[model samples]
Target: MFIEEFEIESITSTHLLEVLTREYPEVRSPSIKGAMRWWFRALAGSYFGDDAQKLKEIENQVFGSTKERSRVKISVTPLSSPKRLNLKEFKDKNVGYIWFSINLLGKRGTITHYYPPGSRFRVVLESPSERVIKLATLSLWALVSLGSVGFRSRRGTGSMKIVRASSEVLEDLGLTTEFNSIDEFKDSLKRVLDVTGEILGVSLPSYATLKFSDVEVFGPGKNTWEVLAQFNNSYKEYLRRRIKKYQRIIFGLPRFKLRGVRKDLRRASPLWFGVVEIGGKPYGRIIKFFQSTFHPEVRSKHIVDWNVLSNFDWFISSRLPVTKVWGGW
Candidate 1:
């Protein structure tokens, strides 16, 4: 097996730590390890199809198979935070009402833990094949640049970037060009999407994969912090306009177990958060996504098309001050 490693620094994100305690005993909590595993599978799903056998083979080969050990072994070094880190007073606007309500009685929402920006960490990997190495590099690049880690990571928290890497790795898998403008960054991301799809021999990624087509990057923001705040606000406003808003669970983890609702009644969560910088200014990218649904009857399990959903194309057309994806919001 061959080994590769790189260092990443937090950029306006709360690099979270493993949670030993849960503020809300009724609900689940977030952990850094959980987020990493999700990213691994999500990226794999996006690059590879979801056909059970096909995915099983790829995931097993890259990560591990039930019968064999993980082809890729990973290690992480935690980041350090300064004193005066006030999680209690800190509030994320995107958290909206749900988190606020939770904090009403306890410190659940009122308090949170995040390793400060400028926080740095390292990831080392051992891989069995060149394919796994290439795939891991691409996933890490996407996760670091566009994706966030930890709770509310799917929102806008825990954003990070690949700050340091070997020349050989950079030459092999790094971004093609430095982004000078918002348009350039968007275009390059699109190219990367296309290239990765080709690398996996597919026109589109698995239905479960987090992908570029799912994202809509807003024009530009005044500063790094401004764009992140906008992303949070934009998402909050987006959810506020929808029906059964509380029923949706994209912005945060599920607060309650939905054992009562018929599985078919549950909606798919396509939304996700991402950010990138151009000209040293931050830009926002919202991933509007959805999954295939099923009919009421379990048998035959006919696939319900995404077109059946209202305003399915809304997010693709929506942007702040640039475009509106939906009406009245």
Candidate 2:
């Protein structure tokens, strides 16, 4: 059996809690596995293109489907007891904007508890095949380094980092778990992307592939919360001042009163937000997954222009001092 382990710590509040008891927070293996599956599918997109059947075959081989058992077994153990915080306590506009769901419920006295930043945990993966272990490792690295976990993950909540890993894991995978500066981090990120491409061997367009994705890094802020707050605040202000309000749907869908759009229709934002550590300081990382913003139903009825996406991309670079960028506009 081949086994790999990683020690992880939360960089932002993680909203992973007991379903019935919101006050109790626990990091479960299923959650981590679910996230890994997402990243794995994203990486697979580069190899399989938009062929759903081929993608499912590879995914089932690695993660399992009803017809087959998975090759990898995942487990999570808490290294340190995580402290809980009530989301209702944060009343700042900046935080509220990003975590609007919690803020909205706060008015009604609904308590949402989360494991605060710095909570530590351990994740282990076991597989008979070394190739399976490598794929799982690559997905986990992408999830923790470039993505977040639990609720509002795409908004920078639940951000995490790998503090330690099994010997040779980083070197073998061509990953840098930590860096001393943004420049170093940028170089490491580029290397990781290159390595990912090399591992996959084929390139094609799909919903969330790195082949057509963009990464932008900003700030070495005081902390993760500080960086998140600043990013949300600036983003809110940017949206607020926009002349074309309906175009906001380009960012995401089911936007309440957008003209000619159904309120029930939902589309996830292609842009993902998370925090990365540089020089022991937190920085903001934004990844844009090049995909259709509008659902097929909405696209058939409305004239959805794609320029809004490019415009927002421009706005972000213009407003913030982007420390580094990878991929196209």
Candidate 3:
């Protein structure tokens, strides 16, 4: 199959998020306790994503399956407050995410829960035809589950599996950029990034001004988001072993699949930051985020910068990969 890879970035998103939590106690917080999920969603889709477009280039010129005739372009499109879920019919958890699939070859597909309630949870969608929309939506969902929205994939150090029943699903979707312009994307990033200033009650590093709509009401979706959703499952037994020793450190580096990764990826943690949408509209609540500074077993080099670097609290580093993704309220 043919393939293209893209990276979305914002230099100080998490840093800004930390600032927001410190500043605006009521308006928002990071992707921590599902408090301001709606705000995060809007910021991620609008500001954070927009900012990434300013410094990133999403491309479609890569070679993965040399002998394959099929080609795939993985683009992440981030947006601001929306009306409903981006996908048509979907399922979700209380605060984390949901997994649903359509059927092809006679609608014979079902989504299975790979984890118990809230442990390294994974929602797998197996279906026929070209379910790129669903695939993309699911990928976004996974990103949100790990608080990874608007953040780079830690030097593009992860793998994605795009499953389509047939090659026809991706036919005709040319090599197109996910946003209107780099500046446009940046504007959106400024919006998401604005959250920090709101939290801090001060303007941000870029000095972007914004409006505060206190009338915005937030609610949780049908799912409960879990940090490190890809932990301790049949597919991730190795994490279980190392998790004991490295529970508080950032770790997933050698296992990361992308290039340009700095030499300091300590361990792999599937993180995301986004909100649930329904019918292309914002459907969830405003959430905040912050984890205990733990997980010390993470690879040493990957610890260059993080929310609480010394404490080993791996904040969902979503600044670099926001240009092409969009999510909730």
Best by TM-score: 2
Q: Which residue segments of model 1 deviate by more than 4 Å? A: 15-50, 82-84, 87-112, 173-178, 187-191, 194-206, 210-212, 232-269, 294-319, 322-329
Q: In candidate 3, how many Å is residue 27 off?
A: 25
Per-prediction TM-score to the true structure, in the order listed? 0.67, 0.78, 0.20
**Candidate 2 on 261-291: residue-level lDDT in tens?**
7642344336767788878877788887765
Q: Candidate 3: which stretches are off by over 4 Å?
A: 1-189, 194-263, 267-275, 278-295, 298-329
Q: What is the C-alpha RMSD of each candidate to the true structure, in Å?
A: 8.7, 6.8, 21.2
Model 1 pairs in collision = 270-289, 318-325
For residues 1-329, could you state the per-residue lDDT of candidate 1 as single tens digits? Answer: 66777777766656343343354332333443345555556565665544656766766666665697766677788656533344353374333332333234235443344466678888776676766666666666656655677544555556676666653433665453245765555565555565566656784343545552355566566766666666545444544555244336434566776564675355534555656655665666555544453322112321211112223235334544443221111
Superior by lDDT: candidate 2 or candidate 3: 2
| lDDT, candidate 3, 221-263, per-residue tens | 2322322232112112333333554543334344444754764
Error of 2 at 83 (Å): 3.6
In order, the Cα lDDT scores of the candidates are: 0.53, 0.68, 0.25
How far out, in Å, is residue 177 in model 2?
1.7
| Candidate 2 wrong stretches, greater than 4 Å | 17-30, 80-84, 87-89, 106-110, 194-204, 239-244, 247-269, 292-315
* Greater-TM-score candidate between 1 and 3: 1
